[PDB]
Amino acid sequence: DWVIPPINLPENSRGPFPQELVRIRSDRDKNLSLRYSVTGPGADQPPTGIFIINPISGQLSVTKPLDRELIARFHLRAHAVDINGNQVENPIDIVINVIDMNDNRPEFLHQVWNGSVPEGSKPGTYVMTVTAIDADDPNALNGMLRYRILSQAPSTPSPNMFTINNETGDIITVAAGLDREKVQQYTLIIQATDMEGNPTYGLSNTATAVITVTD
């Protein structure tokens, strides 16, 4: 059977509601006198009443701003009986996909990671891996994040003893001169702006790390 073309709607619509879309209707009204209704979540079920369908005509409409993070796609189903309450057309399916929008800053799991790194270690050594997550869609720039170190402290010897794999997020050293008696531990702030690190559309957020130099 031919399948009904999916309506794609982005969350956080700005109304006014009800918004207009498709007009699902049966060609029986060519002599008959139909009447419609919808079913399934958003219709006659939780959120009950988000998708309404003008009994007559068939305009299919949505009554509120949506959010992909609660329900991404809707599997509604339209029906049609004639005024003598028969049943002329088998219920047809309808899919309302909800498209992603970057409306979720990235969280960092632990807001305070900890770790160590040996005494005076050769550069490029691996110290620890911090990570973050983003509720927005993963195969999307709204869910693709990148990490960077905003600050280090103490500021000596070199005010940049570490680095962090912009993609995977594991701290690495690039400078030498680590001495647990000259500096027992470091405190770094870690940012993780999303949108593929994009600075003017990515939503940032932070967490910090304490690197304990091993003796």
Summarize as ranges the residues that interact with Ca ion (CB under 5 A). Answer: 67, 69, 100, 102-104, 134, 136, 194, 203
The CA-based dihedral angle spanning residues 39, 41, 44, 50, taken in that order and rounded to the nearest 10 degrees: -110
User: Which residues have a Cβ under 8 Å from the Cβ of 159 and sit 6 or more positions away?
Assistant: 152
Q: Do 91 and 39 form a contact (C-beta atoms < 8 A)?
A: yes
Closer to Ca ion by Cβ: residue 104 or 208 = 104
203 φ, ψ to 5°? -100, 120
Provide the minimum distance between the beta carbon of 9 and Ca ion in the complex, in angstroms, as a whole number: 13
Q: Is 104 labeled as ligand-binding?
A: yes
Q: Is 134 labeled as ligand-binding?
A: yes
Provide the minimum distance between the beta carbon of 66 and Ca ion in the complex, in angstroms, as a whole number: 9
User: Which residues have a Cβ under 8 Å from the Cβ of 52 and sit 6 or more positions away?
Assistant: 18, 38, 43, 60, 61, 62, 63
Q: Is 194 labeled as ligand-binding?
A: yes
Provide the minimum distance between the beta carbon of 176 and Ca ion in the complex, in angstroms, as a whole number: 37
Closer to Ca ion by Cβ: residue 50 or 100 = 100
Q: Is 102 labeled as ligand-binding?
A: yes
Q: Do 212 and 115 form a contact (C-beta atoms < 8 A)?
A: yes
Q: Is 69 labeled as ligand-binding?
A: yes
Q: What is residue 62's three-state secondary structure?
A: strand
Rounded to an integer, what distance in angstroms lies between the CA atom of residue 152 and that of residue 183?
12
Compute the Cα dihedral for 9, 13, 18, 20 and give only its sign.
negative
Closer to Ca ion by Cβ: residue 24 or 203 = 203
Closer to Ca ion by Cβ: residue 70 or 83 = 70
Q: Is 142 labeled as ligand-binding?
A: yes
Closer to Ca ion by Cβ: residue 103 or 170 = 103
**Would you call the peptide bond into 16 cis, given omega within 30 degrees of 0 as the criterion?**
yes
Provide the minimum distance between the beta carbon of 171 and Ca ion in the complex, in angstroms, as a whole number: 23
Rounded to an integer, what distance in angstroms lies between the CA atom of residue 95 and that of residue 127?
48
Provide the minimum distance between the beta carbon of 101 and Ca ion in the complex, in angstroms, as a whole number: 5
Binding site: residue ranges? Answer: 11, 67, 69, 100-104, 134, 136, 142, 194
Binding site for Ca(2+): residue ranges? Answer: 11, 67, 69, 100-104, 134, 136, 142, 194
